[PDB]
Amino acid sequence: EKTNLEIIILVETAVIAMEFWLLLVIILRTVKRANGG
Amino acid sequence: EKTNLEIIILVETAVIAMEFWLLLVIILRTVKRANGG
16 A cells, blocks of 8 residues: 555655754743743 | 655654654753753
């Protein structure tokens, strides 16, 4: 079933976007944690 | 070429592991940032 792959690829994309979202997120949230006082 | 897929899957795995590594990392590093004084 090629479908699986089709998803494996689509997911991969959404993944990379996530990784950057995680760091960026934890980066923004954390950064604020500082001035959060 | 099925090779591509073979990689798309392998990567996916390493990916999920990363996502958890990012959060966990930024979680451990950040957590320390607190007691880091």
